């Protein structure tokens, strides 16, 4: 169980400190069409790219919030910033929101393929399903979080079918 | 054992990405004293000050290195910064280096705040000395690390008696 850590990182050292601020930021853009939800892309094979656009071309950098900063154990300034993205439809605007991977899940899959971390190549998806577990269970019950985070969980065919991450986000997107 | 995940965490996310870069950074800064070292403060009773020039007077804030931005996980330019701190000796100025705690500390102490975390006060100490075992067997063997690394670990007496922080500090700056 070392996604349970890692979920309770992620909300302490992350999402309990920029979502209270969020709503601010991205005002702070619209003015001076935005969705005004946090989405945390959460996939189940842990594959994390660092660049979500090659992940989906639909998938488009648009731009960034403007940076949140606060001095956090010992480092003066320390930088939360976060990234916008347009996403199309067949050459369409559909949607634009602030998007991310949970980057713990790199950590899964780093953990899974260093010897001395102990942590089993098979674990990967069953640690990951941990990890969205918990999460889902600190924000629902978490003050930080009223409708300005959405938690996007997939898991890919891996090579059955295709798959449109994209549309993955468009559906939650329209959902609201 | 909470402990594990996050001090693999650290190294993970954190120490691997940031140090291979540090020395150039650091030369950079001083090009255009400060030590070749990252130090990393660590201490057991997972106490961490936000503000380090007020855990002690005798630190003190001087400057940050230039930041070191990289993509990670869907944020592009997320940034990665650190500061240097100046460390007083009956008001001369004994050293200086890139100093800070680690952050995931704070996450121990708050989880064993949180009822839902299901993580006892008591077990503070001991995440803690498991976390900074485990962090130094990873930092041991890491090639990331080469001299460009120190762990400070203590154990403050807790109102027992007098404790200098800068005199922590100094005495791994002066031991090289
Ligand atoms: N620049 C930094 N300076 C000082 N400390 C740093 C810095 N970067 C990480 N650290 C900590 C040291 O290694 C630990 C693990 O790193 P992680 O990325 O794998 O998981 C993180 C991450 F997912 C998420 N997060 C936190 N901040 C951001 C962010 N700005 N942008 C997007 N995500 C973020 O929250 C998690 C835990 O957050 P931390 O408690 O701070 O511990 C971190």
Redesign the interface.
């Given at each position: 169980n070392?996604?349970?850590?890692?979920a309770?990182?992620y909300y302490?050292?992350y999402l309990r400190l920029i979502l209270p601020e969020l709503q601010a930021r991205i005002r702070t853009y619209n003015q001076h069409a935005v969705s005004q939800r946090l989405y945390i892309?959460l996939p189940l094979d842990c594959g994390?790219?660092?660049?979500?656009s090659m992940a989906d071309p639909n998938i488009r950098?648009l731009d960034?919030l403007p940076?949140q900063t606060?001095?956090?154990?010992?480092?003066?300034?320390?930088?939360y910033?976060?990234?916008i993205?347009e996403l199309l439809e067949n050459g369409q605007r559909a949607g634009t929101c602030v998007?991310?991977?949970?980057?713990?899940?790199?950590?899964l899959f780093?953990?899974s393929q260093?010897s001395?971390?102990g942590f089993s190549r098979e674990d990967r998806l069953e640690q990951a399903k941990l990890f969205c577990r918990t999460l889902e269970?600190?924000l629902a019950?978490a003050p930080e979080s009223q409708n300005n985070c959405r938690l996007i969980a997939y898991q890919e065919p891996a090579d059955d079918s295709s798959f449109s991450l994209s549309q993955e986000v468009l559906r939650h997107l329209r959902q609201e």
């Open positions: 070392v996604a349970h850590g890692l309770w990182s302490i050292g892309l994390v790219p660092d660049n979500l950098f960034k940076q606060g001095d956090r154990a010992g480092i003066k300034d320390r930088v910033s976060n990234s993205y998007l991310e991977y949970a980057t713990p899940l790199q950590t780093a953990m260093y001395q971390a269970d600190i019950d």
